[PDB]
């Protein structure tokens, strides 16, 4: 740090970084009566005296399940058309075919979400999520299409076309990078873009514990239905975990005392499965709020918050489907390759202050020039991308030196 | 050949070996599940159909028209070949409306208008 | 029985509570950010 | 008895610590915002 | 308000304002069979009947440990590098002592 | 104790004051610059000027002013310095 001193890149790096958020955990429906006792009757009519503490679990269990599906819905069912890419992908040099749907294999998947696909009863049933995985793999690719084919448009009224070329333009402009940059290195930014998804690709595939957070939510899951089940079977301090034994050889008072505690135990057994799922299910729900928010703000548009869509400034993110959840790959421009400089917060020309117009000013060592804040191409000082405020007598730190005007032919 | 019976992950009991005739039989649980009824509301009609969730048609009569989802076996909807969207969902992609005599149709989810930017 | 009952409903209370406290932040931020503001997030502060 | 509260600590204690979670994910999106940037969002980073 | 009056400022103030948030909590574990009953073995020996109900509560607040854990090291833990301020600060005026 | 036990922090309390000290100085020295990529330097001066041309007012307008807005900055982080002194009832979310 010096306080004449300032660096500025010379260069810059395309680099795509993934991002993996469940969305939604499996729908299991538990029935009260048949798992505290399925096949006594007697089991049952005592049961009966407890009131409703049979009906609040099917309601919470129900009210989690419709949870489920609205998370989905509401992470993916963003588009009101179905986009479709066009069959020439000419897109300037840029290439998705890792992204872009296969239609040689039967799912329609492309090769990342197939990575990640393969990568990852005592009255308890499991029931089917309302959009099948074909229908999820089509709003991604509907999603991709718009992006790809329109942009920012598709997502805030009607679709309109524009080439990639001049999309990816508009967004570096939308960082504080002017357009020439992108377009006179046009080539070597659609490199940079494909190597980047190969080794995202490549990354997806080597590493076993990439997916951690969806394996985390399905052991869950399957650990509590196992410790359920284990529970079912124990004695709860009674003479044997079976009720059919307890109402064969036992009087009908023991017997009906025995089974009392044993449903007890079921029930409070049932009831902490029921408690710890609402909770589960309440740290899904904020996950999948998180990933619609991401969706909504990353791939339908271009996102100045920090930190959010990436690691560097965002130009673009891509969906990808996973199972229970969602993967991003967030594409970021990040600076590289700078040098040092020296600086200076005005220029004194004929005893008025010269401040840049966008910019900042620099020197080679001998000469001053304007530059861009965040690439390096130097330009003489001139009229027209500087403004004159003041005289040359407030200014901390000014510079003499003179700027040229194009009126003088 | 010295085992009797064997159990799942869960201790739970799925195969027995006959005493008699030394052959394994695979033991399954009797079907069971819940009953779901799909109306168009009282204010429309007031004709059903009914959804026996995760069981097969074949158990159903034990305890109209007859179509197999996967959710499923759907009792007292037509099937149609058609895709509309979503009114009554059903599962697994199927959802059922009130369509015209007059009946109600269980068809496949569609995600919406078909586009293609030029 | 009755303390068991009472305990449910206070458990049922407090997660509720929780998901309306998520919600009235939710409002609040919106009540911040498009009203007294004008929002660059996409589909925050409405369609277009 | 004992059982009943230990359980009933525990619940209280979950639901604490989602609380909690809530509040230092806020914490880290302010970070990653207000410090490390310079947001946009009306009073979010502050008032003005 | 009128349909061709404005106020324009014509100074401003730097106002600087806190803000406080609690990222973390305290990590407990608390023993089932100790707290229930630490040393009559018949009390232990009853307890091993009601099933798996001492191993439920410590996975439960081992995950909050974790948690705790996590929380704390998302929201402090975001820069790669350990930066250091200049030995000579002169910042142009402004003061951060 | 019953059978229940207090374990440690992770991060310990040097630990956390490192990290914060570190993001005081990249904030100070590099911008947001250092969290994007990497740092660049920058005056903090300069580095003001961006920020007021941020909200939609020119650098001129910082760089006409700098005495008194530094003046002002330094009489804020004061007046937090009292404020937090004497009211006590200020961290209330922690206690
Ligand atoms: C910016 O960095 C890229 C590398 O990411 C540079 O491109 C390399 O240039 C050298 C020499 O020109 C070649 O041998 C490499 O094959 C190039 N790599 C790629 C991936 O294209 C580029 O030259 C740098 N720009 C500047 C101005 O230095
Ligand atoms: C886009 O990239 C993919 C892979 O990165 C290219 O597919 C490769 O094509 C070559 C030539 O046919 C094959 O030898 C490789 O095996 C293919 N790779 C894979 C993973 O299948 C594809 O050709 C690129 N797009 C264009 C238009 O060239
Ligand atoms: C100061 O800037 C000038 C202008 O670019 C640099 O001088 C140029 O140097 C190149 C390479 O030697 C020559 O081809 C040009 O003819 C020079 N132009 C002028 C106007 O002198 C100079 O190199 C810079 N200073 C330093 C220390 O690099
Ligand atoms: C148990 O007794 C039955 C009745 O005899 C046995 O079944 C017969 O086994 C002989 C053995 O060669 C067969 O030839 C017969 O065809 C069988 N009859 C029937 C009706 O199955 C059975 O094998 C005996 N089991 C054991 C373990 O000794
Ligand atoms: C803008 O406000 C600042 C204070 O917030 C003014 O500075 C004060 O000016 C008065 C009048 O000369 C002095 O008595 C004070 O000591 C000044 N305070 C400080 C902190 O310097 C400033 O004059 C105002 N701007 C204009 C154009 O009047
Ligand atoms: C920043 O402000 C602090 C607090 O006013 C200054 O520290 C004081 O410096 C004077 C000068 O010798 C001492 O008499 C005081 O005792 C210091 N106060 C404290 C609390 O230590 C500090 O000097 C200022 N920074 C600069 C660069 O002047
Ligand atoms: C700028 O100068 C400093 C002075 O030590 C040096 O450490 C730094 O490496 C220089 N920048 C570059 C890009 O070399
Ligand atoms: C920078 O600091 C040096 C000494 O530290 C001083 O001579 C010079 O005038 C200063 N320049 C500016 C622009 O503050
Ligand atoms: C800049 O030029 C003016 C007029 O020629 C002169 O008064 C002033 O001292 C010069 N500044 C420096 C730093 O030499
Ligand atoms: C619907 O399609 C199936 C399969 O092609 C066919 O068997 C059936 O007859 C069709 N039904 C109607 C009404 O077209």
């Known amino acids: 740090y010096s306080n004449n001193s300032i660096a500025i890149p010379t260069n810059f790096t395309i680099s795509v970084t993934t991002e993996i958020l469940p969305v939604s955990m499996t729908k299991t429906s538990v029935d009260c009566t048949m798992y505290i006792c399925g096949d006594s009757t007697e089991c049952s009519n005592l049961l009966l005296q407890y009131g409703s503490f049979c009906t609040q679990l099917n309601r919470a269990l129900t009210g989690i399940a ?46 990342i979400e197939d990575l990640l696909f393969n990568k990852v009863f005592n009255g308890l049933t499991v029931l089917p999520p309302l959009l099948t995985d074909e229908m999820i793999a089509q709003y991604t690719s509907a999603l991709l299409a718009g992006t790809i084919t329109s942009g920012w448009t598709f997502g805030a009224g009607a679709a309109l076309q524009i080439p990639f070329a001049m999309q990816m333009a508009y967004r570096f402009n939308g960082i504080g990078v002017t357009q020439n940059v992108l377009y006179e290195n046009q080539k070597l930014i659609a490199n940079q873009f494909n190597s980047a998804i190969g080794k995202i690709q ?82 899904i729900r904020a996950s999948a709020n998180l990933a619609a928010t991401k969706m909504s703000e990353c791939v339908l548009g271009q996102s100045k918050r920090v930190d959010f869509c990436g690691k560097g400034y965002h130009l673009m993110s891509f969906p990808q489907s996973a199972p229970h959840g969602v993967v991003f790959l967030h594409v970021t421009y990040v600076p590289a390759q ?55 007598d407030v200014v901390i730190g000014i510079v003499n030196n003179t700027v040229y005007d194009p009126l003088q032919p | ?116 930017v030029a």
């Not at chain 1, 509401?74 to 069959?87: G, H, L, N, R, S």
């Not at chain 1, 200076?344 to 620099?362: L, S």
């Not at chain 1, 130097?378 to 403004?387: A, E, R, V």
């Not at chain 2, 959710?71 to 009130?98: K, M, Q, R, T």
């Open chain 1, 202 to 283: 490549d990354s997806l595939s080597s590493t076993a514990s990439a997916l951690g957070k969806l394996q985390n939510v399905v052991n869950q899951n399957a650990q509590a239905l196992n410790t359920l089940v284990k529970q079912l079977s124990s004695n709860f301090g009674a003479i044997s975990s079976v009720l059919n034994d307890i109402l064969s050889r036992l009087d009908p008072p023991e017997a009906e005392v025995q089974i009392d505690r044993l449903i007890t135990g079921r029930l409070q057994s049932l009831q902490t499965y029921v408690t710890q799922q609402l909770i589960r299910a309440a740290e």
């Open chain 2, 1 to 116: 050949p010295f085992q009797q019976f064997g159990r799942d992950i869960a201790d739970t009991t799925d195969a027995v070996r006959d005493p008699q005739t030394l052959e394994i039989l695979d033991i399954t649980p009797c079907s069971f599940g819940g009953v779901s009824v799909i109306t168009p509301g009282t204010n429309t009609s007031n004709q059903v159909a009914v959804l026996y969730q995760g069981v097969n048609c074949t158990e159903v009569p034990v305890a109209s028209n007859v179509f197999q989802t996967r959710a499923g076996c759907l009792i007292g909807a037509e099937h149609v070949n058609n895709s509309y969207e979503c009114d009554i969902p059903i599962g697994a992609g199927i959802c059922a409306s009130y369509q015209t005599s007059q009946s109600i149709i269980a068809y496949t989810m569609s995600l919406g208008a078909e586009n293609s």
């Open chain 1, 66 to 111: 419709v949870e489920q599906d609205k998370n989905t819905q509401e992470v993916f069912a963003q588009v009101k058309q179905i986009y479709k890419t066009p069959p020439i992908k000419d897109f300037g040099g840029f290439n998705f075919s890792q992204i872009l749907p296969d239609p040689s294999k039967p799912s329609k998947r492309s090769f």
């Open chain 1, 338 to 392: 700078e040098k040092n400089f020296t600086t200076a917060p005005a220029i004194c020309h004929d005893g008025k202050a010269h401040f840049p117009r966008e910019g900042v000013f620099v020197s080679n060592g001998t000469h001053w020039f304007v530059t861009q804040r965040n690439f390096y191409e130097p330009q003489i000082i001139t009229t027209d991308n500087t403004f004159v405020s003041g005289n040359c």
